[PDB]
Symmetry: D2
């Protein structure tokens, strides 16, 4: 895989870091260096924010009609689609993601999401109000201004567009800080945005480390809003940094411990295939991965046997190979962390059914893992592993499983497998999670808002809701004289 975009993207230009420093990105297949990327720090973020400030305050982008920003975003989406193979290859080498899924789903899904916001750009509405005095009131929806985005490594393309798509459609100027593990595709997008007609300073990309570049975005006095996706720990630092700088609003997606509930009436093969998909997609490196599987007692035993057969059949290997179902973990730290959690599961008394060990000659490959006899307060039942590890459990009643599903500090997503309308309605309304997937999984859609409850964070990505977070509501009021109606 070739890398042509390695510098920072500030003010419509690819530039080196002020320090002249570079950091390395590694391929999880081998641990070998892919490329050396310019290492942005506080000085580079300051330059990107100044570029974003100039583009918003005096530049053409927010002054454009919504229709003309949409036309530019539609051209940007078309360019993504023409570089689909190169973009998927970049994400496969940077993050260990399956190339076939990158081409078929991930990269076109990003272009599709950017089309959704491009189509929303000329349809943004405020309200005309109903005053309880002889006055005319209305609200204006205005771009927030300079927005700072801090993004993780698991879905580099997807996360980039969840943030960039709605913010740019709203008329904002952005500074994106991609994960140190995955800076590649974000620099390619900065190049495509420029080609599409996105003006200089509207999209700034500052690759670099978290406590340096990432913290500089969160603490910036001239950034109006920050949207952050990543760990619960860093989410606390981002929220604190906003409080101690300029009181900028913040939106956070902090991961979860997603339960999947399988009832007695489920089709066994469908439910096994669905749970396998929920747990092992992207080597378990997803904020919404099925992690706690609750299977009703009537089908429990047959489910365990089928889940074990299917997991052990999974082809683990080179993500570029189309016969491969599971690639390596992102890097060494993640790989080692998943191994520690697997050891924890064994140490606390859970039963290892399949996997639970690394595989292959080289690379960060871990066997799809199933633990049974998992108790609700166990570490593997409470902590986000972010790896190919399932906690398989049994339940008797609906009331009992609702309590189990909600026995977590998280609340991002949940899966329900049942044919009964009443069970589906009772369970979906009772689980404290932002997204409920009934007889499907990872049912993300550009039109559907996505965001957590509890420690999964707050604010939405996707849907019209995401567009609304990059718009301020301004109330304007004037008295009325001789009105024939009120």
């Amino acid at each position: 895989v070739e890398v042509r975009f390695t510098k920072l993207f500030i003010d419509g230009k690819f530039v080196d870091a002020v320090s002249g420093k570079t950091f390395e990105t590694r391929d999880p297949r081998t641990g070998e260096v892919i490329a050396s990327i310019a290492e942005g720090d506080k000085a580079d973020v300051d330059l990107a924010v100044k570029a974003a400030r100039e583009a918003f305050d005096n530049g053409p982008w927010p002054r454009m009609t919504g229709y003309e920003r949409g036309r530019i975003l539609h051209r940007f989406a078309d360019l993504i689609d023409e570089h689909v193979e190169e973009l998927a290859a970049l994400d496969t080498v940077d993050a260990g993601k399956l190339f076939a899924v990158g081409k078929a789903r991930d990269i076109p899904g990003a272009a599709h999401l950017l089309r959704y916001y491009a189509g929303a750009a000329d349809k943004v509405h405020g309200a005309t109000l109903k005053m309880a005095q002889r006055m005319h009131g209305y609200t204006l929806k205005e771009p927030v201004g300079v927005v700072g985005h801090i993004v993780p490594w698991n879905y580099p393309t997807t996360m980039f567009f969840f943030k960039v798509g709605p913010a740019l459609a709203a008329g904002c100027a952005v500074v994106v800080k991609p994960a140190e593990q995955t800076p590649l595709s974000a620099l390619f997008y900065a190049h495509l945005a420029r080609e599409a007609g996105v003006p200089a300073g509207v999209l700034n990309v500052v690759p670099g480390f978290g406590p340096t570049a990432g913290a500089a975005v969160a603490a910036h006095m001239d950034v109006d809003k920050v949207s952050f996706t990543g760990s619960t720990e860093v989410g606390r630092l981002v929220m604190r940094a906003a409080a101690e700088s300029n009181l900028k609003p913040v939106s956070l997606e902090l991961g979860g411990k997603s339960p999947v509930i399988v009832f007695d009436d489920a089709d066994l093969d469908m439910a096994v295939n669905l749970v396998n998909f929920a747990t092992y997609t992207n080597k378990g490196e997803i904020c919404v991965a099925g992690t706690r599987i609750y299977v009703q007692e009537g089908i429990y035993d047959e489910f365990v046997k089928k889940a074990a057969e299917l997991a052990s059949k999974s082809v683990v290997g080179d993500p570029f190979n189309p016969s491969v179902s599971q690639g390596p973990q992102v890097d060494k730290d993640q790989y080692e962390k998943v191994l520690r959690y697997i050891d924890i599961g064994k140490r606390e008394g859970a039963t290892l059914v399949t996997g639970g060990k690394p595989c292959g000659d080289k690379g960060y490959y871990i066997e799809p893992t199933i633990f049974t006899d998992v108790k609700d307060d166990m570490t593997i039942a409470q902590d986000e592993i972010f790896g190919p590890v399932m906690a398989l459990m049994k339940f008797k009643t609906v009331e009992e499983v609702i309590q189990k599903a909600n026995n977590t500090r998280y609340g991002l997503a949940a899966g329900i497998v049942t044919k009964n309308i009443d069970v589906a309605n009772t369970v979906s309304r009772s689980i404290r999670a932002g997204a409920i997937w009934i007889n499907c999984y990872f049912a993300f859609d550009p039109d559907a808002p996505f965001g957590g409850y509890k420690m999964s964070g707050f604010g939405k990505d996707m849907g019209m809701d995401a567009l609304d977070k990059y718009l301020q509501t301004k109330t304007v009021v004037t008295p009325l004289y001789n009105t024939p109606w009120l």
Copy 2:
């Protein structure tokens, strides 16, 4: 039962008709005269429209804030609740409706629907637009003006408020023409509206005949909008009258031939009790009555036996008696029409399972009727009977029953009885009817819009949609100069 309100209500006053004429209202229990009511004609409608015109053009009502119209409507709703016994008694003697249901459901349901619109009155919003030019655009929601309402006899109170509630909340002045069979409660409401603080000319009630008073409302040159509920035939006359007068928009609720579909997986006792409820409530005198019952072959035989037991045991008699489940038909014409359809049913080859004959010494009482071996092309399977008559049929497949459900001129409502989520979703999306009731029936709610497809008419009653039909949308646009965002 005593009648104290017998005159027309025009310009905040109870007045006699210009002609001095009166018509009689009869008790369906005996055919006896209840009271003599002032008979409004074209001259009285002209006086009511002039009163409504003055109240809208120069009066305080549309000039009030939404909050202050809401406070008056809240007072109006409270007054309804304090006169529940008297109001229910009036609708029983006038329409042959059950007194216990009047007190428990019908009359408080009207006060409740009035509170829903009172609460919407101060929350009406238009939009601020997203112009594709350097312009500021917005929409204003203004009261339509003078509204004419033509209502039927089946739910006198309910129909009155479906129309009056949203129109008064919006700031309109109304002219109500109640059915000749049921003018009583509408005059009591005109008295309560005045007591609540509804200004003179805002709510006018002109009891009288259809081709005289009703036609005068539909054809009026100074009525801005008309809402009609009743027969398909008259609906054609109302729509035509609007076209040949001032091109006022209309909304029409024209009744239906509602199917109820019972699948193999339903709880038989629940399904039987639900269908019995759907077919026989208010002696079948409902636009949404369950008329065509489709029962899947696996449970068909047991369903027929159980449906016949419930229909045959049903207590037919005095609607004032709390042990009575079914009162008399509204009047002689309706009673005779139901009897003609029962006779056509027999002559066309259907099987009479139960009823199919009048009962009692006096009054317009008809036995709950079940016909089996009903073919889709039969008159009783195609025409609205508006009586206690069920057409009970069998089906094998989902695809077959979707076609059967849609094999009608109408599209008002449909019932589905199944526990399976997928069947419920497939069937509900496939039936061309405005309201789909899954595992329930008559699930009307102030927040839920109600209106037909096909020959059942167009426009909505109930929900925020009903409020929207009494508001005009006015687009206002001005250029913008030196805007820092667009």
Copy 3:
């Protein structure tokens, strides 16, 4: 100008009329025959409705996701943009419209409007309701089905897309009946729709006469909705035809008698230039043309003199010539009708200031006309002329001008020229017209709903409102069990 599309477009094919008959389209520049077009009658409309019925009931179009219908409409909009010169030329020869305006505004404005609906296609929302019982209620937005569009000759492209854009985005199948005077561009669009991927039977175009083909669409038993733009007289026949056939809902845009109000604080040159634009654009052949000009007494005299100078400077001639400001009237009937109205103005005592006579050797050219000393009840002050004729009047007070502006049976649009915020708010809220243009004119926008009050008709074209008229609202309700919240 070359004509390559002359046949009917039924079921994705260009076909001759069942009768084999053809009618001629003439060029208003000469009165010479442009082309012979297949003459559709009741038999051809029946074939188009059957094609539309098959495409909706069993075809892929409504089964597509909103996103995929949008992608097809975006391709359709791109194709319009690449045939901009040919399309403008067709509209110039068929309707006598300025070629420079066709290329710069009319044709790209249509492609732009189709992009607006393409972008709305994947964002259509219903509601989840707030039930006052232990129930879950929601609304579904479903395509209405087979839609019939009857369109006038004044803006052939614009009118076509106002109707087709939202109906196709919603998932409907259409039968368009273009005006006999302007069938050309509509057949070119049918060809472009097919090229874009619009499936067979989704867009049917039946050129032909009004009482034959047009009446056949309005009276069709299998058309679910009709949208009509044209004369008040025909609007009555369309509404009546719906009432006497299947009770299909109807939306009507019936023309107007638009007032423009100029206050004492207006910039004289700006207001004169604005009024000149409002009155004479498209030779006065617009439903929203400035027809009644009210100028405040303080500036009245200077306004008349300036309006006369400017009108007499107007270059009347060949619409293909870029130096020409005003083309010929559509045809002989329109030309003669405008001349009769000019004679009426003189006959009833109005003062002819400029024009009021035909000009040139050949073609249907009429001089821009100004009448002063126009009284409010005069025929030229009350009737839609649809020609280059201004009724210039004086007023003293705001209260007086509000009454004058509303002294009409129409209510489509109005213009206000003032710098004062309070006058603008009082006047805009008091004029009973669907569109208020403050210090601008013809401020149409894809995001702004457009539709009349009073005899201008009802229903909206443009904005999200237009999309809503091709969608039915279906209420679906189910009970809830053990819900932790309601």
Copy 4:
């Protein structure tokens, strides 16, 4: 004035603090002790949160229909209205607020705002989505859960209801921590809520100090959301406390430095009376007080003379006296802080036009103060004083004044005084503040959202927006089978 409610209100009961401790509330008119109030600390907040948790998790309140919560809130609003004199008297003695304004505006305005949310309770809607797959998606609006409210002393009643009204309407259980300076009316409301039928644990009121009780609410592990109104400094502490506890979302109203811009074309007497009203209402103790007055050069000199006349004649004294226009500052700290800013104003070179000194024998009375020759970089032009102090300045151009208006850390509200439509539109769109009041001031309305930009905070109080912050959006998705439309 008598005080009957002095204890904490936890779990539907008036209880003493766990410690048995009490704190004193003083009358700003004398510095005299009014009453001794139970002093809530971390232990009492823990008991209130447990009561709120029980009421939400297992209690009837969120299980009620929206309509039934609305009926209780309507009863609650009626009770407020019957105790208006007593309620106003309590806020006068506690906050030094005018008694006449309490009775006429403040207390009935709270009952009115409570009616607005009661009316919204049965109308809360989510959406049915437009999926880009063969799936059915929808959103549910569910109560957030347990909500903590931290309120200031300036508008005790108003602030209480801005928070409590929408949160209770949404189905939440609340813990309110009123300001130590103003705990009185909040305990009276807790008593009225109970009387109205608000269930035990739904509304808890914990009077007490900020770093103790207030910090305990902000840092609570079982509080789902927090709303804070007060100083910027504490706002940082609240946001940080959320980040370091459970990552609960916050909303913050942090005050401002509101500019009022008077253009050359304003009616001088109207503009002067409006600015006087904006600056001195509630002795300048308002987050939206007019603080920086910018007057255009053409009228500057006459404005200063007229503003000084009105400020100097203003009746300062007993807030119980109806002839009094300005009461004392809340307490000693506020009084001393205003005096320090007056001294900084003089020391930094500003010109004292009037006031600038304390008045009277006893009480915290400060003379209405005007400073001229105020430069944009001065402390009195940059810091929120929260006192009767005006910074009166001159400007030449629109562009200049837009920059001056935005030369602040804050962005809460701004006033514009002009008759010109274009200046009003340009200026209103250009000022970075949440509320723009044109030719009026303090134009708050239950239907109008209110919230700041920049360092004034984020989130809205009032309008439907306030209701939305107490509702979670849950996305629910299921596949579809054999759908005839998508």
